[PDB]
């Protein structure tokens, strides 16, 4: 493939137009009073929406290069949300902010290496400021507090959320399932979770969630890398007539057997999905075992001779539910005998006796947790199935923020936090004057979100911003009501975590580009 290559500005300029489109298109939907975009559908009526994430999703430019600039931002702005539960848009918004000015600078004659530096500093600093302004969130009060708010006033919501963490703890594993009746339901059942995503997006069966919810399927607990499909035939057929889904866990899965299942499911007979096993080497050993224990499943170790073909349903584990995402698998209610489960615990416990290491003791400990800890579940009750599934949505939302609120507390959410921090370190200087500018850009860029909101609301940016600077603390302007005050008291905040994330990520990519000197791609 012969490539097309651009340098310096030629390159940067493309990148800039590329990004702008993305940002100019997704930004108009920021405020609570955001405007809407129309996403043309191939089949049927177009789609109107104010959800940046969706908008962003659809963006792809013809001009490669320009398109790269766009995809580059989207990538990290996504990562932002990935590791915070929101900000996706905001990040993008800042992204532009920085990139724009700083990119003019580089092009103006100033040194790029410094500009980046100056910025990073600004960010670094503001990030602290954020830590300062952040208001803790620890007691079940604060918890239900933030929850009910992020659930949009609905107190009942914030309630359960507090209850939940109040059961399995803050670090406890909580999940949601549509309610069976009109009442909400919080229950704790033998269950577990671990960081390990699916090996194929084509597994997702819940598009809007990018997740894979499975109904009381069987569970496979191998101990080798499954490349060839063969081994499965026995079991894969058992579950075929078993009329139930099936999940897999082992070293990994090569396309030979992998690529096959992917299609085998995407419009196929038996529809299943799998994910690598937690831990590596020696660790995985017990790890998987723990799971077997919990699901009442049999572990297939080749270090025992037993092969896959040499296995029947009697060897599979079971749980009533199980969901996986881009990078995490979590089971619910495993059929493992309490006697068995509880016993295993005893085992581990003892093992922690060795205490021969704080890493080994910490380790064993962690397993103890997963296994004996359990998994809290909720069932969004509701009158109509609409409200039902709708509310359910709002719930999963809140929970996010809440976890986040817990982790890093929260702050003013109208773009306020940023304005604040910026006005703060307004002297902050750098060595090279090219670094000062670097810092300005950075700071001035933080005004972005707020100004944009106001803008989208049809209000005076410069004016609102100004008066917001004036006050202090979490004193801000509620775009939604056009009233200033304590954004937090007014129920307008952002999990400290996300705001940072957003801002860091945007900074990241920005400099990244500001330091880019070449771009390669295919020819039109």
Nearer to Mg ion, 51 or 187 (CB): 51
Residue 502 DSSP symbol? H
User: In sequence order, what E strands does 88-245 have?
Assistant: 173-178, 185-189, 191-194, 212-213, 218-220
10 Å CB burial of residue 280 (0-12, 13-18, 19+) is exposed
Binding-site partner at residue 206 among ligand ADP, a second copy, Mg ion, none, CB < 5 to 8 Å by type = none
Site string for ligand ADP, 75-114 (x = CB under 6 A): -----------xxxxx------------------------
Binding-site partner at residue 139 among a second copy, Mg ion, ligand ADP, none, CB < 5 to 8 Å by type = none
Separation CA 47–CA 40 (nearest Å):
6
Separation CA 240–CA 264 (nearest Å):
12
CB 447 within 8 Å of CB 438: no
Joined together, the tokens standing for residue 91 give 């990040």
- 156 annotated among ligand-binding-site residues: no
Nearer to ligand ADP, 82 or 252 (CB): 82
- The residue count for binding ligand ADP (CB under 6 A) is 11
Nearer to a second copy, 193 or 402 (CB): 193
Binding-site partner at residue 290 among Mg ion, a second copy, ligand ADP, none, CB < 5 to 8 Å by type = none
User: In sequence order, what E strands does 335-482 have?
Assistant: 375-380, 410-412, 475-478
Q: Is residue 86 a contact point for Mg ion (CB under 5 A)?
A: yes
Binding-site partner at residue 17 among a second copy, Mg ion, ligand ADP, none, CB < 5 to 8 Å by type = none
- 384 annotated among ligand-binding-site residues: no
Binding-site partner at residue 271 among Mg ion, ligand ADP, a second copy, none, CB < 5 to 8 Å by type = a second copy
Of the candidate residues 13, 32, 301, 328, the single one contacting ligand ADP (CB under 6 A): 32
Q: Rounded to the nearest 5°, which phi and psi values hold at 447?
A: -75, -20
Residue (of 60, 70, 59, 95) closest to 80 by Cα position: 95
Binding-site partner at residue 32 among ligand ADP, a second copy, Mg ion, none, CB < 5 to 8 Å by type = ligand ADP
Residue 115 CB, shortest distance to Mg ion, in Å, is: 30
| Sign of the four-CA dihedral 106, 108, 114, 119 | negative
Nearer to ligand ADP, 29 or 501 (CB): 29
Between CA 50 and CA 59, with CA 53 as vertex, the angle to 5 degrees is 100
Q: Which residues bind ligand ADP (CB under 6 A)?
A: 29-32, 34, 52, 86-90
Residue ranges of the binding site for ATP: 29-32, 50, 86-90, 414, 478-480, 494
């Amino acid at each position: 493939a012969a490539k097309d290559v651009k340098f310096g500005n030629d390159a940067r300029v493309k990148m800039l137009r590329g990004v702008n489109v993305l940002a100019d298109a997704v930004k108009v939907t920021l405020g609570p009073k955001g405007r809407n975009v129309v996403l043309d559908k191939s089949f049927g009526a177009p789609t109107i929406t104010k959800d940046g994430v969706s908008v962003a999703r659809e963006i792809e430019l013809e001009d490669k290069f320009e398109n790269m600039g766009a995809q580059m931002v989207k990538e990290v702005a996504s990562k932002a949300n990935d590791a915070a539960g929101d900000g996706t848009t905001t990040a993008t918004v800042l992204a532009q902010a920085i990139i724009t000015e700083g990119l003019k600078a580089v092009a103006a004659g100033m040194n790029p290496m410094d500009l980046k530096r100056g910025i990073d500093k600004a960010v670094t600093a503001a990030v602290e400021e954020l830590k300062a302004l952040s208001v803790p969130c620890s007691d079940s009060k604060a918890i239900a507090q933030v929850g009910t708010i992020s659930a949009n006033s609905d107190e009942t919501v914030g309630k359960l959320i507090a209850e939940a963490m109040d059961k399995v703890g803050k670090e406890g594993v909580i999940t949601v399932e549509d309610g069976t009746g009109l009442q909400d339901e919080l229950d704790v059942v033998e269950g577990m979770q671990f960081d390990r995503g699916y090996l194929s997006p084509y597994f997702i069966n819940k598009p809007e969630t990018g997740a894979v919810e499975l109904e009381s399927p069987f569970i496979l607990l191998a101990d080798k890398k499954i490349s060839n499909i063969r081994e499965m035939l026995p079991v894969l057929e058992a579950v075929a007539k078993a009329g139930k889904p099936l999940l897999i866990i082992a070293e990994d899965v090569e396309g030979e057997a992998l690529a096959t299942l992917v299609v085998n499911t995407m419009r196929g007979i038996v529809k299943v999905a799998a994910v690598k096993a937690p831990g590596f080497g020696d660790r995985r050993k017990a790890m998987l075992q723990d799971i077997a224990t919990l699901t009442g499943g049999t572990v297939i170790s080749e270090e025992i001779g037993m092969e896959l073909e040499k296995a029947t349903l009697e060897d599979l584990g079971q749980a009533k539910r199980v969901v996986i995402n881009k990078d995490t698998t979590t089971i619910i209610d495993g059929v493992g005998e309490e006697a068995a489960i509880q016993g295993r615990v005893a085992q581990i416990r003892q093992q922690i006796e060795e205490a021969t290491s704080d890493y080994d003791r910490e380790k064993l400990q962690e397993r103890v947790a997963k296994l004996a800890g359990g998994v809290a579940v909720i069932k969004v009750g509701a009158a109509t199935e609409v409200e039902m599934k709708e509310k359910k949505a709002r719930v999963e939302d809140a929970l996010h923020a809440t976890r986040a609120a817990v982790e890093e507390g929260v702050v003013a959410g109208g773009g306020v936090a940023l304005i604040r921090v910026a006005s703060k370190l307004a002297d902050l200087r750098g060595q090279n004057e090219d670094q000062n500018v670097g810092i300005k850009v950075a700071l001035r860029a933080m005004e972005a979100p707020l100004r944009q909101i106001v803008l989208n609301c049809g209000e005076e940016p410069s004016v609102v911003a100004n008066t917001v600077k004036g006050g202090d603390g979490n004193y801000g302007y509620n775009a939604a009501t056009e009233e200033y005050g304590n954004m937090i008291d007014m129920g307008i905040l952002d999990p400290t975590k996300v705001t940072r994330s957003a801002l860091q990520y945007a900074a990241s990519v920005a400099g990244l580009m500001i330091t880019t000197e070449c771009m390669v791609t295919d020819l039109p």
